[PDB]
Amino acid sequence: RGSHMEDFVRQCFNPMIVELAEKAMKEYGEDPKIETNKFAATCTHLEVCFMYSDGGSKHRFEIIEGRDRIMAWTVVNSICNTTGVEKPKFLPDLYDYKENRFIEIGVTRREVHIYYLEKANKIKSEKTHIHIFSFTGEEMATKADYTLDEESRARIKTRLFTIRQEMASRSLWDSFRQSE
Amino acid sequence: RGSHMEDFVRQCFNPMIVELAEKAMKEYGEDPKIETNKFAATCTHLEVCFMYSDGGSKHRFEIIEGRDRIMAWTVVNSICNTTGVEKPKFLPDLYDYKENRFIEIGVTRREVHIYYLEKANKIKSEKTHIHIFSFTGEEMATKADYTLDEESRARIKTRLFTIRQEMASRSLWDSFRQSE
Amino acid sequence: RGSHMEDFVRQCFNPMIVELAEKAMKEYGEDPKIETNKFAATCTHLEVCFMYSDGGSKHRFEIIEGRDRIMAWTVVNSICNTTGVEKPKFLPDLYDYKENRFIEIGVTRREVHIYYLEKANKIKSEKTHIHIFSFTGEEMATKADYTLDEESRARIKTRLFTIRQEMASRSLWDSFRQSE
Amino acid sequence: RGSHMEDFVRQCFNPMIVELAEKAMKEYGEDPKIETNKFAATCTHLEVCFMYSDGGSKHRFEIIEGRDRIMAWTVVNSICNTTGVEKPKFLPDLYDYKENRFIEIGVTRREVHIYYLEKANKIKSEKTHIHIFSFTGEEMATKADYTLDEESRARIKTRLFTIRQEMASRSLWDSFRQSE
Amino acid sequence: RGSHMEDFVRQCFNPMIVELAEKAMKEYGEDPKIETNKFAATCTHLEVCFMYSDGGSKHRFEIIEGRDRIMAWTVVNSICNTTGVEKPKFLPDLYDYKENRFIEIGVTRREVHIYYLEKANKIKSEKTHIHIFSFTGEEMATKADYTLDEESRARIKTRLFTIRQEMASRSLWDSFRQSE
Amino acid sequence: RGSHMEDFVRQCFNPMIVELAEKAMKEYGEDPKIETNKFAATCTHLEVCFMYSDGGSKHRFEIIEGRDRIMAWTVVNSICNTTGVEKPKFLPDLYDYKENRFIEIGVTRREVHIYYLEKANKIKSEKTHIHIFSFTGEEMATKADYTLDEESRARIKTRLFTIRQEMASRSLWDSFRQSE
Amino acid sequence: RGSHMEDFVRQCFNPMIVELAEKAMKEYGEDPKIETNKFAATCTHLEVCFMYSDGGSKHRFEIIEGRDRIMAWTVVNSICNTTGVEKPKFLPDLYDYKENRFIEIGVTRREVHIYYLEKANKIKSEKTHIHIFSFTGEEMATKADYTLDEESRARIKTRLFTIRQEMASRSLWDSFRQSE
Amino acid sequence: RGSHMEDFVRQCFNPMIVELAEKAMKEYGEDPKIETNKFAATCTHLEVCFMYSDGGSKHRFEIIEGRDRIMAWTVVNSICNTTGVEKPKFLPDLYDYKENRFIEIGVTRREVHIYYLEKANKIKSEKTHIHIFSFTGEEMATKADYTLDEESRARIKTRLFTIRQEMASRSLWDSFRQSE
Ligand SMILES: COc1cc(CCNC(=O)c2nc(-c3ccccc3C)[nH]c(=O)c2O)ccn1
Ligand SMILES: COc1cc(CCNC(=O)c2nc(-c3ccccc3C)[nH]c(=O)c2O)ccn1
Ligand SMILES: COc1cc(CCNC(=O)c2nc(-c3ccccc3C)[nH]c(=O)c2O)ccn1
Ligand SMILES: COc1cc(CCNC(=O)c2nc(-c3ccccc3C)[nH]c(=O)c2O)ccn1
Ligand SMILES: COc1cc(CCNC(=O)c2nc(-c3ccccc3C)[nH]c(=O)c2O)ccn1
Ligand SMILES: COc1cc(CCNC(=O)c2nc(-c3ccccc3C)[nH]c(=O)c2O)ccn1
Ligand SMILES: COc1cc(CCNC(=O)c2nc(-c3ccccc3C)[nH]c(=O)c2O)ccn1
Ligand SMILES: [Mn+2]
Ligand SMILES: [Mn+2]
Ligand SMILES: [Mn+2]
Ligand SMILES: [Mn+2]
Ligand SMILES: [Mn+2]
Ligand SMILES: [Mn+2]
Ligand SMILES: [Mn+2]
Ligand SMILES: [Mn+2]
Ligand SMILES: [Mn+2]
Ligand SMILES: [Mn+2]
Ligand SMILES: [Mn+2]
Ligand SMILES: [Mn+2]
Ligand SMILES: [Mn+2]
Ligand SMILES: [Mn+2]
Ligand SMILES: [Mn+2]
Ligand SMILES: [Mn+2]
């Protein structure tokens, strides 16, 4: 193709982040060359997931997002068959060894309330914790339990607003927002 | 030879883990090419030992497993001739500088109670702590003192069930279980 | 799945070779988890292509195989729009800056004559050079022009027979041969 | 040119520190080849800023100094548009995610009181924290809040006096002091 | 700013190539953020210069392009004060230790004849060799002496047409061509 | 020369440790080729000093031992001219930013009481803390303040007894002990 | 044990050379801790083999020595089943793709004539080339064909005499010579 | 001390070159802190020696300069006891495996004829080849045999004039010239 959004994603995100999002999109029958707005969303969600696991202790989180579908489900089985928690119907993003629960991370262009309502409606397993982030600096989590400390969460929303600024600087933000 | 279990071990475990287990098996007159089930057990026990030492402080544990027999006994002498603890009759796996005791790590395909009974019957030195892990997610330790925190131990049993799943996925688990 | 052939490919070939073949198979709607015999063939063909380019001078060959379909065709256009050679109907493997021609590399489980007859029948552009290799140590090329020197070609067929031996050692060769 | 101060800066400071100060000076129309005293000051201020961020937690500080003017202001916007703090009129050096305030770092050849009076007079945003260091081992901060612990701050002033000694050892200190 | 050409240059060229062109443009009072077409030209000329020196022997060429103005002229003085050749009025790109002459490399969007006529009219030192390349695959040199072998020069023009294709793929070529 | 002790030191200690001890011995007019027993002592003292600084926080200790005489005294001046402590008459080994005092580390083949009595008699500055270690597992410090935690100190004496065992294993210990 | 020869081997030879010789000795039921003279011989023979392959072209030699017995024989089969040469009764050291023959390398403490007579008497396959080196600087090869150029062979014998000097410097040469 | 020449040497020459010259000067009872002009000469001579060996084939030269006195003489013995050449009375710089002779490299601030006359008068072994270089771009060798090709020698004299320019740029050349 040859879009400005594609070259911005390869320049804005880490090379391994781009490669992991490309594998995830291709595994689900999607083309980052054409679905460039979704390409920027998968990369952003991947970085937020990895920054989220970077907060806390060394053995606190088990990263589920970023693996291929078969191996990601294999880790979920080992976590469920060990701690005893229920098997989630959908693939979560992380697991908290400190709180004994799975975490579903969400990044939002609209309001954090709307996505969470849709994310909580999909996830029938009420035990799975949910944590939403927005490109404007807002956040919301299940039972007001934000898991990480304030500084690690603040670094996540700061990076989110930087991506939003770099997008609007080259005029890709308007098409990116009205696309979720 | 040319077994499926051998190629799985080289693919499932870290290269240095495979090399250390090969040296340990050859030092005791064993061939990983033929004793492929024991090859997978030594690798699993080595990774659990190294993950165990990864939990805690930086100078907490002194790793005994993984060294050759002569040097491993040399470290044991230095630890005994310094802290004043008794010399164990058999080579332990680690030493706890925080609890002032040696640790014997065990990985189990049957029940954790049976191995511990055999491990405690062999080790005459009652001061040496014993910690058993199973491929189903169970654990048991001397005086209910599990040494590490809950998160580090949970990561160990999660990896153990992942190895069990990958084994049964290629149909090596049945021969691996009925072989201990 | 969980096949012996898959674990052998990850153990026999270089990690980047495995990753490049996985991307090529997925790009064309193929699964290395199920098409394990084709997985071993794409890896073997990729290594032969890279060993082929390793022979000769530093700027002699332009590697076409291993790139994604869009970029690989982009290089072909630049080579054709510069030297003046005809655009091949199908994607070749390399280009010879010394002989001013594209090269189509083939690896064969049957006879080198049969594949070349099929490879020459497909490639309508008669200018594209063709070079076939077999797992038994045979080779054949267009106009008896084998491009590289004898030592580099001998190293290719030696590696091919080593892959054949390691396959039959674990009893994957019979299914691999009767599958082309 | 060919000054002794220039060769001392390249020998005393880290290569990346020298490169970052050269880019900052050139971006503001300054030549490190001629403004060698200012070259040593920008390098010293850069190292102090980086040593300052090295103290504390992992996600405590967001480094603003060292970036180009456009990107540095982009981070400031993301920090302000997220936490809700006021936009500073001038570019600060760091941001404290623990104390929710920007930090202006200063290095001084005269008295710490004089610079702070000038630094506080320039910065109209009273919320921005100010922390001054001197080449004699003195320090002063807003509301006597020195942010970091005593050991990290002591390491900063120790390095400052080492730079002062190495300068006077080669007789560049007198020209460096009477130049601020 | 936020241009598509800028993000393409950072994605198309090597990171060090981008950094060297940014330093060269800033040293001569130019902004790669605004002069994005000239930014792509300096990067292309830098890569061609480095690919040119990559052809031949190990000690054949002395790279002049890529250094800052003062050091680049220092090398020219050492080359002139040693071999005895005349000092060029303008900074050349390379020096040939095999042919005992400086080389001026040119990359062209129009015809190779027009630039060479302007390049030869500027360079009064007739001893300095001139070698022009075009984005269409053409080349021309002084006295028909193309210095390098055919394969190394062909690799240069092939890369030039690839840059032209990637530019027109994202629709930056038309503005890039009508800008020289 | 060609001594067994020399080859043991290069094999027992880290390469950089050997290089730092060689520079220290040569700076004071000593030859590690002939003073092989002193060569093993300087290496042992250097490793203990570096293991000592490895215990505690990140910015707790400033390493003085291992630097050349001029730079080591330069750091001492910066530490004294900043914290305000007295200048020691002799070069110490470390400085404690947490306890605000210099540390003199000693390694002993005889009794820890004898060296400390000689070390305390030499060091007139009573503020400088003193910490002695022995090859048998004993330790003693000023005012019974052992600075580090128990685990870090235990790791030091364990390494000391390992060096003693490896020395007696090759029969260099007897000459090493009766040489202090 | 604790021998001077052992510590000299670990200090004189490359770490990977020592590890490869240890694996080869253990595979054949030998202990480098006790067979220290044979330990120095296997290391010397391994380095000579690797220096030998370093001479010539890039794809000239296929290294057989250094591999485990099963894989080394696998390469020999691939070389024989491709070029058509006869299978040697004993494991050779290298294969010459330029001369189409296997090479048996020998290192000698006595006279080069005596070993070659024993090496040629053992190797029944007269096609396998034989090349002997001595610690005094002598060499002899089959049909006076020394394969490599003079400079590469001279570097081999120079290293051999350096090992002999370092051995006699520490007084291990006399026991090493009267041990072959 | 604190001289401009010292900081220039650490900035002009490669770090390992500086370390090797410091060891050589200290081994012969010289201080680079005070003998700064000799410090720049040993570094220059070391780089010329290493650039000289960089010219030619891979196994052509054996580097003698840069080693400590004992090991350097050990290599000379191995070279003499192998090729059969005479033992030089003084330590040479290199040995030519292609020409079978030792090489004495010289760098000169005066005329190349004067040094060679002194270098040839000292070296009684007439077989040792002599090659002189000057800071003005001149060279002279025994029997007009300049060993290397023209391009490698030209790169040496070009670097020599660059060092001369950087010295006079900071005004250290006049003291450096009138000091040989
Ligand atoms: C669209 O198919 C896929 C599937 C995967 C694997 C698992 N995916 C997730 O787990 C996940 N996906 C999204 C997301 C992103 C873009 C558009 C729509 C959604 C719902 N957002 C999340 O927060 C999240 O956790 C990866 C990528 N694309
Ligand atoms: C099956 O679709 C693909 C397509 C590609 C991209 C381009 N492919 C080739 O260029 C190529 N493909 C084969 C091959 C391998 C397995 C089965 C059948 C064939 C014909 N053999 C070659 O020699 C060769 O050059 C890569 C992988 N799979
Ligand atoms: C002179 O223009 C510049 C501008 C920048 C970008 C932002 N600069 C700062 O933020 C900053 N500048 C100084 C400083 C240093 C030398 C002379 C005068 C001053 C006031 N001191 C600080 O403490 C500080 O934070 C970088 C370098 N030079
Ligand atoms: C515009 O000022 C500069 C100056 C330098 C330093 C030296 N420059 C060259 O040597 C050089 N410059 C060009 C070029 C590029 C863009 C627009 C116009 C020209 C004439 N083309 C060349 O071929 C070439 O060798 C680097 C970058 N920009
Ligand atoms: C003998 O001259 C030197 C001098 C230095 C520089 C500073 N030295 C120390 O600081 C230091 N020296 C010893 C030590 C070691 C061997 C024999 C006698 C002594 C007293 N022991 C320590 O504990 C210690 O701190 C380094 C090496 N050798
Ligand atoms: C003693 O068993 C072994 C066997 C191997 C595997 C293959 N070995 C060789 O190929 C080989 N062995 C020697 C050698 C060395 C010491 C003592 C006696 C001999 C004959 N010399 C060679 O030249 C040579 O090629 C490796 C090591 N030890
Ligand atoms: C002054 O003592 C030393 C000794 C060595 C070891 C061997 N030295 C040489 O081989 C050598 N020395 C010089 C040189 C340099 C400065 C002043 C006088 C001379 C004659 N010039 C050479 O060309 C050369 O080969 C290294 C350094 N300094
Ligand atoms: Mn997800
Ligand atoms: Mn999610
Ligand atoms: Mn054990
Ligand atoms: Mn155990
Ligand atoms: Mn192909
Ligand atoms: Mn093909
Ligand atoms: Mn600032
Ligand atoms: Mn500041
Ligand atoms: Mn130019
Ligand atoms: Mn040019
Ligand atoms: Mn000391
Ligand atoms: Mn001490
Ligand atoms: Mn052999
Ligand atoms: Mn042999
Ligand atoms: Mn010399
Ligand atoms: Mn010389």
GROMACS .gro file of C-alpha atoms in nm, chain C:
model
  180
  361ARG     CA    1  -0.053  -3.067   1.734
  362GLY     CA    2   0.268  -3.220   1.866
  363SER     CA    3   0.468  -3.396   1.595
  364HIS     CA    4   0.822  -3.532   1.603
  365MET     CA    5   0.901  -3.367   1.269
  366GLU     CA    6   0.822  -3.020   1.406
  367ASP     CA    7   1.053  -3.051   1.707
  368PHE     CA    8   1.323  -3.187   1.476
  369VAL     CA    9   1.299  -2.884   1.245
  370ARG     CA   10   1.336  -2.638   1.534
  371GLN     CA   11   1.636  -2.840   1.657
  372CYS     CA   12   1.802  -2.901   1.319
  373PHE     CA   13   1.774  -2.557   1.156
  374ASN     CA   14   1.886  -2.212   1.262
  375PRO     CA   15   1.630  -2.010   1.464
  376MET     CA   16   1.608  -1.732   1.204
  377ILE     CA   17   1.566  -1.994   0.929
  378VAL     CA   18   1.270  -2.139   1.120
  379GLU     CA   19   1.116  -1.794   1.169
  380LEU     CA   20   1.155  -1.701   0.802
  381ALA     CA   21   0.996  -2.028   0.687
  382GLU     CA   22   0.709  -1.982   0.934
  383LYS     CA   23   0.638  -1.634   0.797
  384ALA     CA   24   0.654  -1.762   0.438
  385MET     CA   25   0.418  -2.052   0.510
  386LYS     CA   26   0.169  -1.834   0.699
  387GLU     CA   27   0.178  -1.570   0.425
  388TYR     CA   28   0.063  -1.838   0.178
  389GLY     CA   29  -0.201  -1.985   0.410
  390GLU     CA   30  -0.002  -2.281   0.546
  391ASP     CA   31   0.046  -2.407   0.901
  392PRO     CA   32   0.389  -2.543   1.004
  393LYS     CA   33   0.217  -2.717   1.297
  394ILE     CA   34   0.026  -2.944   1.056
  395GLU     CA   35   0.226  -2.923   0.730
  396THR     CA   36   0.538  -3.042   0.910
  397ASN     CA   37   0.688  -3.213   0.604
  398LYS     CA   38   0.648  -2.891   0.404
  399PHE     CA   39   0.788  -2.707   0.707
  400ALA     CA   40   1.110  -2.908   0.679
  401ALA     CA   41   1.122  -2.845   0.303
  402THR     CA   42   1.090  -2.466   0.326
  403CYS     CA   43   1.361  -2.457   0.593
  404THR     CA   44   1.593  -2.675   0.384
  405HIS     CA   45   1.531  -2.466   0.072
  406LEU     CA   46   1.595  -2.147   0.270
  407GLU     CA   47   1.928  -2.270   0.408
  408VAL     CA   48   2.043  -2.388   0.064
  409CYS     CA   49   1.954  -2.046  -0.079
  410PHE     CA   50   2.155  -1.871   0.193
  411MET     CA   51   2.450  -2.110   0.161
  412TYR     CA   52   2.438  -2.051  -0.215
  413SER     CA   53   2.468  -1.674  -0.172
  414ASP     CA   54   2.751  -1.731   0.077
  415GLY     CA   55   2.959  -1.867  -0.212
  416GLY     CA   56   3.134  -1.621  -0.440
  417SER     CA   57   3.215  -1.255  -0.395
  418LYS     CA   58   3.063  -1.011  -0.146
  419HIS     CA   59   2.836  -0.821  -0.389
  420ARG     CA   60   2.775  -1.109  -0.631
  421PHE     CA   61   2.424  -1.218  -0.531
  422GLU     CA   62   2.105  -1.034  -0.438
  423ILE     CA   63   1.895  -1.256  -0.213
  424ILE     CA   64   1.528  -1.264  -0.316
  425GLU     CA   65   1.411  -1.568  -0.121
  426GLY     CA   66   1.337  -1.493   0.245
  427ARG     CA   67   1.166  -1.158   0.187
  428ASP     CA   68   0.792  -1.106   0.198
  429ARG     CA   69   0.611  -1.117  -0.135
  430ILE     CA   70   0.574  -0.741  -0.179
  431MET     CA   71   0.933  -0.646  -0.098
  432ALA     CA   72   1.075  -0.942  -0.290
  433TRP     CA   73   0.894  -0.821  -0.602
  434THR     CA   74   1.019  -0.468  -0.531
  435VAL     CA   75   1.381  -0.587  -0.549
  436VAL     CA   76   1.304  -0.776  -0.872
  437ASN     CA   77   1.169  -0.456  -1.027
  438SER     CA   78   1.481  -0.260  -0.927
  439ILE     CA   79   1.705  -0.532  -1.071
  440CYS     CA   80   1.506  -0.547  -1.396
  441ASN     CA   81   1.470  -0.168  -1.430
  442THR     CA   82   1.849  -0.132  -1.389
  443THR     CA   83   2.024  -0.414  -1.576
  444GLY     CA   84   1.752  -0.438  -1.840
  445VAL     CA   85   1.671  -0.808  -1.804
  446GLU     CA   86   1.317  -0.935  -1.851
  447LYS     CA   87   1.074  -0.949  -1.560
  448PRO     CA   88   1.029  -1.314  -1.453
  449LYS     CA   89   0.672  -1.440  -1.432
  450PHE     CA   90   0.746  -1.612  -1.099
  451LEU     CA   91   0.952  -1.505  -0.800
  452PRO     CA   92   1.312  -1.631  -0.835
  453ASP     CA   93   1.550  -1.706  -0.548
  454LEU     CA   94   1.861  -1.498  -0.626
  455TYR     CA   95   2.011  -1.268  -0.887
  456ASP     CA   96   2.368  -1.298  -1.015
  457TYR     CA   97   2.534  -0.958  -1.058
  458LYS     CA   98   2.831  -1.140  -1.214
  459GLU     CA   99   2.633  -1.338  -1.475
  460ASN     CA  100   2.339  -1.093  -1.507
  461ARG     CA  101   2.061  -1.347  -1.454
  462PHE     CA  102   1.814  -1.467  -1.193
  463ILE     CA  103   1.864  -1.804  -1.024
  464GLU     CA  104   1.590  -2.052  -0.927
  465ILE     CA  105   1.712  -2.292  -0.658
  466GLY     CA  106   1.548  -2.631  -0.613
  467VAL     CA  107   1.585  -2.906  -0.354
  468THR     CA  108   1.468  -3.252  -0.451
  469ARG     CA  109   1.377  -3.584  -0.288
  470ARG     CA  110   1.328  -3.764  -0.622
  471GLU     CA  111   1.554  -3.730  -0.927
  472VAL     CA  112   1.708  -3.396  -1.024
  473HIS     CA  113   1.590  -3.446  -1.383
  474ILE     CA  114   1.220  -3.461  -1.295
  475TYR     CA  115   1.208  -3.140  -1.090
  476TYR     CA  116   1.416  -2.943  -1.341
  477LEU     CA  117   1.179  -3.054  -1.617
  478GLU     CA  118   0.888  -2.924  -1.408
  479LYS     CA  119   1.079  -2.613  -1.298
  480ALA     CA  120   1.183  -2.532  -1.656
  481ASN     CA  121   0.828  -2.598  -1.780
  482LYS     CA  122   0.684  -2.350  -1.529
  483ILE     CA  123   0.942  -2.073  -1.574
  484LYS     CA  124   0.863  -1.937  -1.920
  485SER     CA  125   1.146  -1.681  -1.897
  486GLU     CA  126   1.428  -1.890  -2.045
  487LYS     CA  127   1.687  -1.637  -1.925
  488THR     CA  128   1.635  -1.730  -1.559
  489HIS     CA  129   1.905  -1.978  -1.456
  490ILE     CA  130   1.798  -2.297  -1.279
  491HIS     CA  131   2.003  -2.495  -1.026
  492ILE     CA  132   1.870  -2.814  -0.863
  493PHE     CA  133   2.005  -3.005  -0.564
  494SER     CA  134   1.907  -3.348  -0.434
  495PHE     CA  135   1.923  -3.517  -0.095
  496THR     CA  136   2.146  -3.791  -0.242
  497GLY     CA  137   2.429  -3.561  -0.353
  498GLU     CA  138   2.331  -3.488  -0.715
  499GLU     CA  139   2.304  -3.151  -0.887
  500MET     CA  140   2.214  -3.014  -1.229
  501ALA     CA  141   2.203  -2.663  -1.375
  502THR     CA  142   2.109  -2.479  -1.692
  503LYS     CA  143   2.362  -2.519  -1.976
  504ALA     CA  144   2.585  -2.712  -1.730
  505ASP     CA  145   2.675  -2.374  -1.574
  506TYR     CA  146   2.691  -2.441  -1.200
  507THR     CA  147   2.775  -2.077  -1.115
  508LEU     CA  148   2.963  -2.137  -0.789
  509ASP     CA  149   3.293  -2.318  -0.752
  510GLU     CA  150   3.309  -2.688  -0.673
  511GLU     CA  151   3.383  -2.650  -0.302
  512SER     CA  152   3.082  -2.430  -0.224
  513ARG     CA  153   2.845  -2.663  -0.410
  514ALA     CA  154   2.994  -2.968  -0.236
  515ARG     CA  155   2.926  -2.810   0.103
  516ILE     CA  156   2.560  -2.770   0.004
  517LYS     CA  157   2.507  -3.135  -0.089
  518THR     CA  158   2.697  -3.248   0.221
  519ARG     CA  159   2.456  -3.055   0.444
  520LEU     CA  160   2.166  -3.202   0.245
  521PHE     CA  161   2.276  -3.559   0.318
  522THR     CA  162   2.325  -3.473   0.686
  523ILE     CA  163   1.963  -3.356   0.708
  524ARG     CA  164   1.859  -3.680   0.537
  525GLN     CA  165   2.057  -3.888   0.789
  526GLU     CA  166   1.918  -3.706   1.093
  527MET     CA  167   1.568  -3.754   0.952
  528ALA     CA  168   1.606  -4.129   0.899
  529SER     CA  169   1.778  -4.158   1.237
  530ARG     CA  170   1.450  -4.057   1.404
  531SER     CA  171   1.242  -4.225   1.129
  532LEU     CA  172   1.095  -3.916   0.961
  533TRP     CA  173   1.269  -3.968   0.626
  534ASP     CA  174   1.025  -4.221   0.478
  535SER     CA  175   0.727  -3.989   0.530
  536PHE     CA  176   0.937  -3.693   0.412
  537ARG     CA  177   1.048  -3.857   0.086
  538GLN     CA  178   0.703  -3.985  -0.020
  539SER     CA  179   0.546  -3.642   0.021
  540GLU     CA  180   0.705  -3.421  -0.246
   0.00000   0.00000   0.00000
